[PDB]
Amino acid sequence: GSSGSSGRAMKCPYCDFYFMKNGSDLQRHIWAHEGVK
Ligand SMILES: [Zn+2]
């Protein structure tokens, strides 16, 4: 699919959104649900 040739991405511990299993942007996306500036 458009997110990757084999699919099977990780899913967020707070919402419906997806990232690559070792992506650094996931840590910022989670810290944003935890309310960090
Ligand atoms: Zn999320």
Side-chain angles (χ1 to χ4, degrees):
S2 307
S3 56
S5 306
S6 57
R8 201 66 175 182
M10 94 83 232
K11 197 172 190 163
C12 175
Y14 295 80
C15 78
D16 194 56
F17 203 85
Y18 298 82
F19 287 89
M20 190 279 178
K21 66 180 180 180
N22 197 28
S24 190
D25 295 275
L26 176 59
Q27 302 302 104
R28 181 59 179 175
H29 179 90
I30 289 168
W31 286 324
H33 293 295
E34 288 282 88
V36 185
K37 294 184 179 181

